[PDB]
Amino acid sequence: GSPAFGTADLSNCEREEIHLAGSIQPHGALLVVSEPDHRIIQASANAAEFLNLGSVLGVPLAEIDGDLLIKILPHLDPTAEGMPVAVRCRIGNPSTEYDGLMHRPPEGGLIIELERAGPPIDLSGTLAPALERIRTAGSLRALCDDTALLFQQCTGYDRVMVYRFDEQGHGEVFSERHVPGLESYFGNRYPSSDIPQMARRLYERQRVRVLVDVSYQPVPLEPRLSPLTGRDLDMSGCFLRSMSPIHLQYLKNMGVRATLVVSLVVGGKLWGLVACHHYLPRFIHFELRAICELLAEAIATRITALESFAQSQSELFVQRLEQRMIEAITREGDWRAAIFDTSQSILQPLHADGCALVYEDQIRTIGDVPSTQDVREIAGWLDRQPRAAVTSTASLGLDVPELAHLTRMASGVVAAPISDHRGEFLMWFRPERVHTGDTPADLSPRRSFAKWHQVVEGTSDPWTAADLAAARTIGQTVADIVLQFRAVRTLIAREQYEQFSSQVHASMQPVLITDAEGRILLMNDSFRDMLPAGSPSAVHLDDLAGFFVESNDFLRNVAELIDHGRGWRGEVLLRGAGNRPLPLAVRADPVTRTEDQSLGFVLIFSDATDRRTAD
């Protein structure tokens, strides 16, 4: 079901049991020693020759001329914190030093790996100053560039590259140093699947991975199976683990002969590698390996710092945006002038290329954006089914295929609403990121770069959880201040209605203000009181028809006003007693809403006594 270790082609190389290769590389020996017994129950086949011993398989370390058992025994104790642990020990008829690495796999026993010791170290600082250059690295690029130059120096490898992984798992050759006379892969990219997950877990677990020679003949582990009725020993943590041929082939295809890959984990997750490649075999001494791990933890630390600092910039942004909306505007009344840069680009916190804002059926944009009709259709998508509070896609085209056409400038969009309205939000865009089965023999970096391109088809850079979080706090700041702003503006409008309104009420003349359909909204006293005081109660300009010399001249004039929107200027009589009482002047006018439908009408009278002059 899952390919045996050195037995898989590309249709299944992802699932390779790379942890259960029953063999090792020949620059060290491997011993698996039993619990209590402390009796070699399983050993690499080069053990005797390599360690200059005779009988090994089935011999307690108590024997094995030397000093191994005594040099490892402190670490098998309640006292210590377990292992992995490295020892320095002597082994032989006459004796030789070795650097031992022992760790316990889940069942199996102790695995002890031995390599031949190297000369001393001194340097001496080298660590101190390099290490503070990591700390001072002004920026992710300045850092990496320096990590690469720095490792190139520390380990004389022909080339070193630091890769960065994206949320997708795809790699990018983020920096690179290489001696003259070689290709340069600086800038390359490669599919997430070029480094299978199981590998990656190991890259997290043990932070250094050495291939001394691409053509090594793997020395098989002996009594292959575990005799503690286990089976294929779990080499998850064996420094001397054989490598998958798939990768071995890759490396031959590149011309590379040796490898040293020290991983970078940042926030407990695997951020990328520092891959040192040599075009002649090569081997770094355990001590120099220790140094490397330190750099990887130092480098990482800065990487975490630099992230944090970015979060700093963003936090500040939203702050200065909130302050900017309250101040800059809303005191100059309304808040949109703050949204756009002029100086503080709302683009940076998402590292987007354009931004659009749709509010009260109006769009304004900054940067590379699609087209108002396009921006509308996206708006449609977001609205057609709830959810909310920040939404994204890095492949709009392939997420809703009718929209595809807008892939060159908005493969990726992030949209955060600013009110519970619908059709009201802030949305950011990114271009198609692409502006920057076979067999085991066909693999290469140019074959990997293309293919990366095949995947990543209609996609933008993905939205980093950092990005999305910025989208959340901005949209959330914006809405909060926009909602307080709308509540307050209601209150002011209330005060402005009341008032204005009173002024009409204070008029000695009769006025009636009505709405577009003709129903009375306001009727001051002056008017009310002239209706021979004593019922009925008018809801519509029609209802008033009777109080004026009966007249369907009022209806009809009112008709003109309601239907047709044209006002009038004439007189009306008004009924009461002897010689049909006093006549008032009237003058109704519409108040425009848009142009085709009105808002309402105001009919003020009045000049009781026939006097504009007249004529």
Q: Which amino acid is at 75?
A: H
Told to check if 165 binds ligand BLA by CB under 6 A, we report no
In terms of CB distance, is 305 or 492 closer to its own copies? 492
For residue 230, the minimal CB distance to its own copies (Å) is 48
Residue 10 in contact with ligand BLA, rule: CB under 6 A? yes
Of these partners, ligand BLA, its own copies, none, which one is at the site of residue 587 (CB under 5 to 8 Å by kind)?
its own copies
> Measured from the CB of residue 469, what is the shortest distance to its own copies in angstroms?
6
Q: Rank residues 434 and 504 by Cβ distance to its own copies and give the closer one.
A: 504
Q: Considering only residues 185, 317, 463, 601, which one is a binding residue for ligand BLA as defined by CB under 6 A?
A: 185
335 binds ligand BLA (CB under 6 A): no
Among 47, 150, 199, 328, binds ligand BLA (CB under 6 A): 199
Whole-number minimum distance, CB 126 to ligand BLA, in Å? 23
Q: Indicate whether 148 belongs to the interface with ligand BLA (CB under 6 A).
A: no
Work out what residue 226 binds among its own copies, ligand BLA, none; the CB cut-off runs from 5 to 8 Å by kind.
none
Give the burial string for 70-107 (b: 16+ CB within 10 Å, else e). Answer: ebbeebbeeeeeebeebbebebeeeeeebbbbbbebee
454 touches, from ligand BLA, its own copies, none (C-beta below 5 to 8 Å by class)? none
33 vs 39: CA distance, rounded Å: 5
Residue 214 engages ligand BLA in binding (rule: CB under 6 A): no
| Closer Cβ to its own copies, 405 or 489, answer by number | 489
CB of 529 to its own copies, least distance (A): 14
**SS (HEC) of 248-296:** HHHHHHHCCCEEEEEEEEECCEEEEEEEEEECCCCCCCHHHHHHHHHHH
Q: Which of 195, 212, 394, 523 binds ligand BLA (CB under 6 A)?
A: 195
| Cβ atoms of 75 and 110 closer than 8 Å | no
CB of 178 to ligand BLA, least distance (A): 12
Which of 155, 226, 259, 459 is close enough to bind ligand BLA by CB under 6 A? 259
Rg of the chain taking only CA atoms, in angstroms? 41
Window contacting ligand BLA (CB under 6 A); options: 183-191, 332-340, 343-351, 363-371 = 183-191
CA pair distance 352, 274, nearest whole angstrom: 29
Residue nearest to ligand BLA (CB): 13
If the CB atoms of residues 166 and 515 are measured against its own copies, the closer one turns out to be: 515
Sheet with 412-417, strands from edge to edge, namely 362-367, 354-359, 425-430, 412-417, 391-393
Let me know: does 115 contact 98? Beta carbons within 8 Å.
yes
Which C-beta is closer to its own copies: that of 300 or that of 602? Answer: 602
Which of 3, 14, 468, 469 contacts ligand BLA by CB under 6 A?
14
DSSP state for residue 578 in the 8-state scheme: S
Residues that bind its own copies (CB under 8 A): 315, 419-421, 469, 472-473, 476, 480, 483-484, 486-497, 500-501, 503-504, 506-509, 511, 513, 521-522, 587, 589, 591, 593, 599-600, 602, 604, 611, 615
Q: CA of 166: how far to CAs of 173, 311, 429, 432, in Å?
A: 12, 18, 18, 16
User: Rounded to 5 degrees, what angle do the CA atoms 536, 538, 544 make?
Assistant: 100
Which of 448, 473, 524, 557 is close enough to bind ligand BLA by CB under 6 A? Answer: 448
Q: Where does this chain touch ligand BLA (CB under 6 A) — which range of 241-249, 331-339, 509-517, 538-546?
A: 241-249
Rounded-to-integer distance, Cα 522 and Cα 500, Å: 12
Report 17-76 residues binding ligand BLA (CB under 6 A).
18
Among residues 176, 249, 231, the alpha carbon closest in space to that of 13 is found at 249
Q: Residue 486 binds which one of ligand BLA, its own copies, none, with CB within 5 to 8 A depending on kind?
A: its own copies
Q: How far is the CB of 166 from ligand BLA (least distance, A)?
A: 14
Neighbours of 580 (CB within 10 A): 11
Q: Which residues of 586-609 are buried (b: 16+ CB within 10 A; e: fewer)?
A: bbbebeeeeeeebebbbbbbbebe
Whether 19 contacts 448, CB under 8 Å: no
- What is the per-residue burial (b if ≥16 Cβ within 10 Å, else e) of 346-380? bbebbebbbbbbbbeeeeebbbbbbeeebbeebbe
140-154 and 127-136 helices cross at what angle (nearest 10)?
160
- Which of its own copies, ligand BLA, none does residue 445 bind (CB under 5 to 8 Å by kind)? ligand BLA
Does 275 interact with ligand BLA (rule: CB under 6 A)? yes
Rounded to whole angstroms, the Cα distance separating 212 from 281 reads: 6
Q: Judged by CB, which is closer to its own copies: 465, or 533?
A: 465
Burial 485-521 (b: 16+ CB within 10 A, else e): beeeeeeeeeeeeeeeeeebeebeebbbbbeeebebe
Closest-CA residue to 379 (of 396, 395, 354) = 396
Q: Which does 598 bind (CB under 5 to 8 A by kind): ligand BLA, its own copies, none?
A: none
Per-position x/- string for 585-604, each x denoting binding to ligand BLA as judged by CB under 6 A, each - no binding:
--------------------
- Interface ranges with ligand BLA (CB under 6 A): 10, 13-14, 18, 171, 173, 185, 188, 190, 193-196, 199, 209, 243-244, 246-247, 250, 259, 261, 273, 275, 277, 443, 445, 448
